[PDB]
From Swiss-Prot, chain D:
The protein's assembly and partners: In plastids the minimal PEP RNA polymerase catalytic core is composed of four subunits: alpha, beta, beta', and beta''. When a (nuclear-encoded) sigma factor is associated with the core the holoenzyme is formed, which can initiate transcription.
Gene that produces this protein: rpoC2
Family named by the database record: Belongs to the RNA polymerase beta' chain family. RpoC2 subfamily.
Compartments where found: Plastid, Chloroplast
Protein name as it appears in the record: DNA-directed RNA polymerase subunit beta''
Coiled coil: none
Role played: DNA-dependent RNA polymerase catalyzes the transcription of DNA into RNA using the four ribonucleoside triphosphates as substrates.
């Protein structure tokens, strides 16, 4: 606990499921400049500030980043105790926030604008920690690869980051069918294992 | 009517039933 | 020069050229148990050492369930085992294969 | 009316392990009868063993009935009628496709 | 009274010194279990560990080979006083004449 | 004599439980030193009081 109440007007307020993250914002025309020198984490809608867990080397200079949100929608069924009581309740339930630095700190309105997928900072509400993501560049070109053709694939609950070309992508139907087929194969093998003839058998 | 509703909302073959091989080596209709 | 976080793997040369793993990945006809990884288990207790409750009868008794119940699944598996559409472990379809066919 | 669900003879699917279970149960019953004739066990033990083993076999068959339908033939008409709630029960379907 | 069944075909390996010998109600010999034990079903590719600490009946022996879904043990954890307990009597009838 | 589904504590009951296995009988035969033909005849032995010749 810092024990002093900061002025949240000069900070970036990022809301999470169980936490609120504050990052100092330098004066800028477009609110996309972040200062990672001063940062605080608070309980949900609480004015008791604290120091977050810095688990990775944080940038010590002003950088222009793009915020994103990661989570799952919780569509519940609230009890109906009134005539016009709502039939459903939908919540975004953000879990991880991704900060993607702009290439060369360029503005969004510039003629050449690209996102630097090599410097990703994630924020976790469960662990109350901010760390730097580990990406696996696989696009040919090394460090001279053009940033106008890049695709960042995020899987495994925000733990796997890969940079692949834009043309080499899979449609949503493909990945959905892949995961469904994998789960179905695993469950079918689990079900058929208990049969006394599973040993002398063949999956066709 | 319960049988009809169950047939309507049952679903579709999702895993090994819909495809013989893994789609890794490799839904379609879009309606507005 | 490269940082700990920024990994570089330009050459993707990881291929499961082994037949069993390739068929398991691509969903091709392959045995459920890898024949290479099969381990010969040691000899268990003989019929004499087991108790009388678990001791099998010396002469094979008669039962109405000694034969295998005929089914459409077995006939269709025998029909499609020919012409090379599917491959079965042996010459006669087993119950696990009949269930898999009932599914697919 | 459009789908026209129906039930047939081959549509009553038994679990793929009924034969093995019934065979081992009757084998144990015959072994126990032979040993009862020898004098190793008395009448009440034979009665308890038979009742318990057959009740356990029937209960295991009824327990494995539903997962078999869900995994192997999810769109089975009997399974649809039982799971939807239209007509039937687990006990009643056990009489049809089990024991 | 839940019945533990073998997950797959294989040999049973356990330490017989911890279990106490006893006689089951079915006239069969078994090992009484009173402490949490670990038994291993040794199969071609995998090992399985399933057992429950409280008073149970082990109807198998060490190094014995068992097939899938056979009754390895009987948990028998459910035990309580029965107010409806009845002293039912059964008679044994002679099957041959003599002295 | 002891009961049903109770841990056997009598020495003769545990002895018979171990004797239910053929290997234990073979081990006991080897320990006693008698032959198999002698062990077969030991079963057919008159027990109780034996009259004087």
């Amino acid at each position: 606990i810092v024990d002093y109440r900061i002025n949240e007007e000069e900070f970036h307020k990022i809301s999470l499921l169980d936490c609120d993250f504050f990052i100092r914002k330098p004066p800028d025309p477009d609110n996309d400049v972040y200062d990672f020198r001063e940062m605080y984490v608070t309980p949900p809608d609480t004015d008791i500030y604290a120091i977050p867990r810095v688990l990775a080397p944080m940038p010590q200079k002003y950088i222009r980043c793009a915020m994103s949100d990661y989570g799952c929608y919780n569509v519940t069924e609230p009890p109906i105790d009134a005539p016009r009581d709502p039939m459903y309740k939908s919540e975004r339930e953000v879990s991880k926030v991704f900060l993607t630095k702009h290439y060369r700190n360029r503005r969004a309105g510039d003629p050449e604008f690209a996102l630097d997928f090599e410097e990703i900072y994630v924020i976790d509400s469960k662990t109350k920690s901010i760390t730097r993501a580990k990406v696996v560049v696989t696009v040919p070109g090394g460090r001279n690869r053009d940033r106008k053709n890049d695709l960042l694939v995020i899987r495994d609950n925000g733990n796997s980051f890969k940079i692949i070309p834009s043309e080499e992508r899979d449609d949503p139907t493909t990945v959905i069918e892949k995961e469904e087929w994998k789960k179905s194969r695993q469950d079918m093998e689990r079900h058929l294992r208990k049969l006394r003839d599973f040993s002398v058998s063949n999956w066709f | 009517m319960l049988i009809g509703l169950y047939v309507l909302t049952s679903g579709n073959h999702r895993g090994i039933c819909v495809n013989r091989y893994n789609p890794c080596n490799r839904k379609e209709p879009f309606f507005s | 020069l490269s940082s700990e976080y920024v990994i570089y793997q330009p050459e993707q040369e990881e291929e499961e050229l082994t037949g069993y793993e390739l068929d398991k990945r691509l969903g091709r006809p392959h045995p459920f148990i890898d024949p290479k990884t099969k381990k010969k288990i040691e000899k268990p207790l003989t019929s004499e050492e087991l108790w009388w409750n678990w001791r099998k009868p010396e002469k094979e008794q008669w039962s109405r369930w000694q034969r295998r119940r005929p089914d459409v699944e077995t006939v269709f598996l025998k029909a499609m085992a020919e012409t090379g559409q599917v491959k079965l472990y042996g010459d006669h379809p087993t119950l696990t294969e009949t269930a898999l066919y009932r599914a697919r | 009316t459009a789908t026209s669900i129906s039930l047939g003879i081959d549509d009553l699917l038994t679990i793929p392990s009924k034969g093995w279970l019934v065979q081992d149960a009757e084998q144990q019953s015959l072994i126990l009868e032979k040993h009862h004739h020898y004098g190793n066990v008395h009448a009440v033990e034979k009665l308890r063993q038979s009742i318990e083993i057959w009740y356990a076999t029937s209960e295991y068959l009824r327990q494995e009935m539903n997962p078999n339908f869900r995994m192997t033939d999810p769109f089975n008409p009997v399974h649809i009628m039982s799971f939807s709630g239209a007509r039937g029960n687990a006990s009643q379907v056990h009489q049809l496709v089990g024991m | 009274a839940e019945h533990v069944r073998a997950p797959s075909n294989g040999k049973i390996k356990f330490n017989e010194d911890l279990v106490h010998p006893t006689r089951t109600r079915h006239g069969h010999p078994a090992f009484l279990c009173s402490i949490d034990l670990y038994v291993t079903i040794e199969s071609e590719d995998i090992l399985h560990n399933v057992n429950i600490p409280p008073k149970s009946l082990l109807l198998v022996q060490n190094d014995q080979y068992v097939e899938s879904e056979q009754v390895i043990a009987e948990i028998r954890a459910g035990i309580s006083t029965l107010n409806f307990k009845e002293k039912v009597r059964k008679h044994i009838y002679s099957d041959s004449d003599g002295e | 004599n002891e009961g049903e589904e109770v841990a056997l504590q009598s020495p003769e009951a545990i002895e018979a439980f171990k004797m239910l296995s053929p290997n234990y009988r073979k081990k006991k035969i080897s320990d006693m030193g008698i032959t198999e033909d002698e062990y077969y005849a030991k079963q057919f032995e008159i027990k109780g009081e034996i009259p004087e010749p």
